[PDB]
Structures are given as structure tokens and as C-alpha cells.
Enzyme design. Sequence first.
Site: not given
Length: 501
Positions: A174, A280
Amino acid sequence: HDREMLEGYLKDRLGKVLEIYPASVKRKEDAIFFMVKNREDGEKYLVVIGSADVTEEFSGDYVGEIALEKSKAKSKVKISERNHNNLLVLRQYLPWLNPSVCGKRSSFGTGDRLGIATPAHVKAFEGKECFPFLAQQSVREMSRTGRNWLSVLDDAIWGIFESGYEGAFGADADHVKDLEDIKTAIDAGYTMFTIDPSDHVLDPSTIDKAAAEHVFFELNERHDFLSKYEEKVYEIGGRKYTFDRDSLIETVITYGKAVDHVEKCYLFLKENNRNPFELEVSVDETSTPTTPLAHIFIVEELKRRGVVFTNLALRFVGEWQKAIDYIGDLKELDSTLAEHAAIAEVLGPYKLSLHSGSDKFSAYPYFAKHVGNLFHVKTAGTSYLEAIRVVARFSPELYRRIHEFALQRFEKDRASYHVTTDLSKVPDISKIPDSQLEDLLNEPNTRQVIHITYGSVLTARNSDGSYLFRDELFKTLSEHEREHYEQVASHIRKHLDLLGV
């Protein structure tokens, strides 16, 4: 498979009370694998039963020899510590203990800052139409917990082994900014890479016109944005979006270098990652909500450059503060969500990703309405808050000490996050009896204080050099595991239900 017999056998030969997790018990090859917990200290261990061929690869102590009537030759029994080497070998024997790519189906990330919550997360996902990202932690979180890609992934996978789940799951690296961090995440075998180019995002209002002209000039001379987009029109969702020269130049100055960095990161992945992976792209850390024009610009640029992505994390209108519900006008959220959904439909399709979406229940109806077929939501702190709630319920003394400590450390840890916490509205602890301490985890401002001081709580040291809360925290959660699990699972299940899955 008969639990008495195995527990009896282990206690007789080892002199400890080792309790089998029934769901963990797997049979593959001609080997048995399961997990046990020591009733007295709460330590967990892997137990292998099989031929010497199998047990040799695992490290540990030989307990003895057991007689399966699978055949007649006695199997060996080994008890092994949960460490990297043993888990790599396990991940070969049980192939489902490996992250895999999600693709364009709806997903939900249950990050674990503690490293013990994954069985609960798995419970929450039972019977839902959702792909679970069970390993998810950011570079900043791991900095603040003393953890790394490998330790995070190990914690999740040991949890999954305990759960007995055999379905698919993801590991999400992340908010990665640097190639160095992409590299170590690749080496750890992560499957999704969240690229954060916010260092390269430029607020045009912070520089003077000369600087803006210079930024636009160099970007434009290497890409010719004017030729490609100037006066271009997109008829999306019954609306017209025009790249007038000024909107274009602002959008280019804002996101141009960020698109370059996303691309460079993607190329590095293509060069260094043999194994399957998703990407992402995140732009949620900007001073203003993402305009529709910016959404279109970013996506069309990524398609032109050949950057293949599954998730796009936008900054939606309103305030999305940690530990608290949505703040803002729900009708503007509705309308902008319609716009963004329409853009994603014609432009992709691609999944819109929501960061800090934990506890924003008032926003979920609109989110489910616009994108429910293709969406992603990230959580992490909310699970930590649930563990603190369980502490409140079963160890009030400890919650009290943590509470006061959290208040003292809030101004320091607050800085990195943007919260409008009102410290005056945190109830007086002295007026609350033990039997009701838990209710503090229902008050917004208290939640923010405990949410944000997680690092300090988890790593703080005595003068001695011993941990101030860590040891007790983990011991308490160990002793109240069942209640911990059920608490966390129910809370995640609420999120999932509200999203329509």
C-alpha cells in the site's frame, strides 16, 4: 481427524496442553498439517505428520511416531515453530497459502496493524461475493510498527493457515512511493502494488506563473498534451467535458509528473516481476477533490502510455477522516459519484478504490449505488480500534493506562494525519466505571485519539527498555482470542453488508 487422540498423544509425549484448531487440519500428499495453541502461554505451533521425506524439510522437534491406518508403516510426528523457512515449505505443500491477483471483481482490504487479526477477517468474508486482501499495510504503517513486507505477509498467511480457508486472497503493497520499496515488495511476492505519486503532484496555486509555465513547457514538449487534448470533448454520462486550454494546462501542471512516476514504477514492475501482479494508482492525497477532467486526463494518459491498472483511488468531495463517519454534503457526494462512475464505465472498465473508507457508513449507500459491481475499499485502523474495544471489555485497567497514554501522545502522532479532533469532547475517564469503559470506543474523538497513537502504543519502551504496553496488549488479546475474533469479524461483516455484497 479424531481430535482427542492427537491432543492426548501430544500431551503425553511433550507435557504441554496443545489444542488443535479443527479447521486448520489439512491432508495433502500423504501428510497431515495442522496448527496447535499452548493453553498455558498461547504460543502456536505447526504440527506435521508424515514420512521422513516430508518432516525433514520442516525444522523442529520430533515428538514421536504415530500409526495411521492409512497404511501400516508408522508416520513421523514433528512440532515446528512458525518462522519464515517453515512457512515457505508449508506454502509449497498447501498451494492455496499464496497471494493471487484479484482482477476486475469487487474486493475489500482488511489490513492488520497487529499481525493477529487475519482469522477474524477470514470469518467476516464467509459467504460474501468479495475478493479479500488479507495482507495490506503501507510503507508508513510498517515504519511505525517496526514491520516489513515479509513479516506482514507471514502474519497474514499464518492466520489463513489457522483459519483453514482455501479460497483466493491478495497481498497489497500500500502507498508505495519509491522503487526500493517496490523491489522488496516484489521479492516478498506481493500481488497488488499501490502507487502513490503524491510527491510529484503539484498544486498550481503554490507556485508563481513563471514556474507553472516552466513545468507545463517541459511536460508539453515531451508529450504534446496540447495536440492530443486541447479542445477535446468527452460525452460521458449525459454530460460534456471539454479540455479548454486553461483546464488542460492546470491539469497537466497538477498531474503530469505524477503520471510519469506511475509509468516509471509500472515499467520497473514489468522489468523485475516475473510473477502475476495488479496495479492501483492513487491520487487521494490532494488538497482538492479530483475533478472529472483530471479523472479523464489521468486515465487516458495511462492508456496511451500502456500502464495497465485495475484500481483508481480518487479524492472524493467531503472530509474522510480516520475512525469517523463521512463528513460533507451527501448530495454532492451522490452527483460526483455518478460522474466518476460514468467516466470509469466508458473509459475502462476499472475499479474505483476508496482509502480511509472504514466507518464511513453514511457514504456507503451512494458508493454501492454508483459502483457496486466494481469497487475496492481499504481498511486497517478500524481493526485496531476493535481490539482496543476488546481490551476495554476484558481488561479495564489496561484500557485506562492506554487511554491516558494515547492522550499524551496525540499532538505528536497527529501531525502526519489531517483530523479535526475535538479533545474537549473526549469524556472524563475518572467518571466512567469499569463496566462501561468500552463505550469510549463509540465516541468519535476518542476513536481518533486511539486510532492515531497506534504506533506509540505498539513500540513505546520503558526506561528499563521493556515495552510499555506491547507485551500486555498481545497477552490480553491472546487470552481473549475468541471474543477478539468475533468482535473484529462482526465489524468487518457490517462494512461488507452495507456495500451490497
